[PDB]
Write a protein that binds this DNA or RNA. Structure first.
Ligand code: BEF
Lengths: 208, 328, 49, 49
RNA sequence: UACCCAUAACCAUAUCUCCACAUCCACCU
């Protein structure tokens, strides 16, 4: 799902996605259309997972999605510092927390892009609010990106919850040791050295 | 700093973003100081080797041999208890060798292996004198009690006491005469010593070793300096100086001046010996490359390195296990 | 004199080398090493008073 | 040395003679301003410039 | 609360590198 982006990128991804369902909503369109399409995608995906479906949702600009929502969001009720509705995020919050794992088959995995360090209170506030809602975080630093190094992941801040649940005891314990080792290593230099180290073998092969 | 985010003159004082270093020159390494926490106390060499031994005069200790031998070699000093008798009267601060000391520490003990499957003529609680024929071929050495096992003999210069009721003193406690040992007032202690109760023959054996101070080296000195009070010593030196003639009063005043100096100057002599050793700032002992990567170093660096190695070896050794001779 | 001091050092060295040596066909190599005597002579000719 | 000559020893006999006169600030400048006080010598050089 | 009400973030201050020590030979008292 794509919101508030440039149409040329829409064309590029759509042709280059190799048939995967790409839904787009440019900044050209009225934001009411953006909300309409986003929520229709939401309800359709909810139905599909309700049918035990495994659904992957790739959301564009989740914090800038919050900004677009605020564009759609006039009243703010009591003016929060920044100007967002009391019930605004509850639509994004439902949309996000709906992504979950069930024992009854199927799944809903939603990964979204967050725009942060944007110099304004709204984006930082949304970053904090949805920071405590997601089960995994991936920070991408400006300094890493400016050096044209991608993926420019802020490794230290990035992480998940409940590794043992998703990762076996051998796996979870061995990356327990692995984090105990790599937590000291400096970010960019970690990039080069671990890049060289893992260019030798596949991840499992590296563990092998 | 290590990273350099918050460094600039608008915001040098604001704590660094990726760092925590306040802006400063290398002069900090000229003045900032280190320290080493020794696991074992040690004494400043000056106070123990100066011609007037400050330790040797503050305490009634001979500088040339006593101070060093207790402070380096395995010798024991002890304040509290010395009333145990070895053909020699009570002890208060006397210096005794660790051989005879270790002896008096745990009684007067001798052990003799016995052949298995041979029931020696000596029973569990038999008093034995020198010359008594313990077996077709075995003879003891001194008056005491011989303990029998199936297969060993234990000759202890201790006193055994049969009893048939409950125990008042359990195994481990060291007792003074008149104190109830077992069976209430029926059995009471006769001498200083430790109590061991064996219910196999239902008997209390009392050794003649009372709980006495055992110390070596600097810690001992510290203990002494911890238990020393300056004012009483000052008064005592006053009386011991005013009354007698000139010869004794000479040394009396020679130590009284030191005691008065300690008392009136503040700093108490407990920290006269040092527990944590300071470490000079690096720039006062810098390792500077000469040529070809080789580094010329001040010998201070080597001395600190040796001290660190010894201290870490001590820490490891004391952590793992205690072979006594190796520990000393 | 410096030569004979170095020579005695080499003699002690070869004594030890024989001591842990097992077989006998080792006369040139496993017996004599030039380091002690050469170092002694060099030290005498360089750093002596 | 190799780079620059180095200063001159001012020892103690010279110090004794300097204080034998009534010279008070001369010795003070020559012990701190011209010899050891790093901040002092930098400030003095800047001021005289 | 929204008009008042709500603000805190980004850049420019410098005497040093080695020369240590040992041995030896000289010069001036
Ligand atoms: F919002 Be937190 F994760 F409790």
């Amino acid at each position: 799902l794509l919101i508030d982006e440039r149409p040329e990128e829409v064309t590029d991804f759509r042709e280059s996605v190799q048939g995967a369902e790409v839904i787009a909503s440019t900044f050209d369109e009225p934001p009411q259309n953006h909300i309409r399409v986003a929520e229709f995608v939401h309800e359709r995906a909810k139905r599909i997972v309700e049918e035990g479906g495994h659904v992957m949702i790739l959301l564009d600009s989740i914090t800038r999605l919050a900004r677009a929502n605020n564009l759609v969001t006039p009243p703010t009720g009591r003016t929060l510092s920044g100007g967002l509705d009391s019930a605004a995020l509850y639509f994004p919050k439902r949309f996000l927390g709906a992504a979950r794992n069930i024992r009854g088959g199927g799944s809903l995995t939603i990964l979204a892009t967050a725009l942060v360090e944007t110099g304004s209170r709204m984006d930082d506030v949304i970053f904090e609010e949805f920071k405590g809602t997601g089960n995994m975080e991936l920070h991408l630093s400006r300094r890493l990106e400016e050096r044209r190094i991608f993926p420019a992941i802020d490794i230290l801040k990035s992480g998940t919850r409940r590794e043992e649940l998703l990762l076996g005891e051998e796996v979870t314990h061995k990356m327990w040791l692995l984090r105990k080792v790599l937590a000291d290593m400096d970010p960019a230099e970690a990039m080069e050295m671990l890049l060289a180290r893992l260019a030798r073998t596949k991840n499992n092969k590296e563990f092998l | 700093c290590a990273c350099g985010k918050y460094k600039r003159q608008r915001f040098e004082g604001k704590v660094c973003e990726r760092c925590g270093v306040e802006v400063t020159k290398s002069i900090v390494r000229r003045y900032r100081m280190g320290h080493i926490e020794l696991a074992t106390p040690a004494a400043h060499i000056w106070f123990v080797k100066d011609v007037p031994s400050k330790i040797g005069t503050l305490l009634d200790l001979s500088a040339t041999e006593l101070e060093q031998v207790l402070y380096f070699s395995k010798y024991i000093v002890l304040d509290p208890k010395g009333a145990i008798l070895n053909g020699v009267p009570v002890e208060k601060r006397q210096l005794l060798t660790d051989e005879e000391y270790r002896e008096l520490r745990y009684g007067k003990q001798e052990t003799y292996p016995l052949p298995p499957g041979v029931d020696a003529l000596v029973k569990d609680g038999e008093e034995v004198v020198k010359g008594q024929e313990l077996a077709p071929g075995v003879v003891s050495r001194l008056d005491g009690v011989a303990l029998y096992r199936f297969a060993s003999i234990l000759v202890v210069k201790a006193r055994v006491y049969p009893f048939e009721d409950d125990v008042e003193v359990s195994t481990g406690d060291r007792v003074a005469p008149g104190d109830v040992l077992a069976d209430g007032g029926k059995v009471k202690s006769d001498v200083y010593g430790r109590v061991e109760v064996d219910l196999v023959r239902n008997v209390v054996r009392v050794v003649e070793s009372y709980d006495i101070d055992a110390r070596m080296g600097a810690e001992a000195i510290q203990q002494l300096l911890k238990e020393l009070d300056l004012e009483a010593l000052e008064k005592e030196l006053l009386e011991e100086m005013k009354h007698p003639s000139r010869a004794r009063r000479a040394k009396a005043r020679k130590r009284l001046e030191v005691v008065r100096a300690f008392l009136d100057s503040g700093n108490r002599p407990e920290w006269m010996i040092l527990e944590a050793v300071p470490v000079l700032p690096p720039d006062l002992r810098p390792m500077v490359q000469v040529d070809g990567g080789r580094f010329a170093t001040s010998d201070l660096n080597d001395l600190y390195r040796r001290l660190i190695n010894r201290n870490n070896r001590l820490k490891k050794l004391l952590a793992q296990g205690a072979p006594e001779i190796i520990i000393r | 004199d410096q030569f004979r001091v170095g020579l005695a050092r080499l003699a002690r060295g070869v004594r030890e080398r024989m001591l842990m040596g097992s077989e006998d066909s080792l006369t040139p190599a496993k017996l004599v090493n030039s380091r002690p005597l050469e170092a002694a002579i060099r030290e005498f000719f360089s750093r002596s008073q | 040395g190799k780079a620059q000559f180095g200063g001159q020893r001012f020892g103690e006999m010279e110090v004794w003679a300097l204080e034998a006169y009534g010279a008070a600030h001369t010795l003070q400048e020559m012990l701190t301003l011209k010899s050891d006080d790093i901040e002092g010598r930098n400030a003095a050089y800047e001021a005289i410039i």
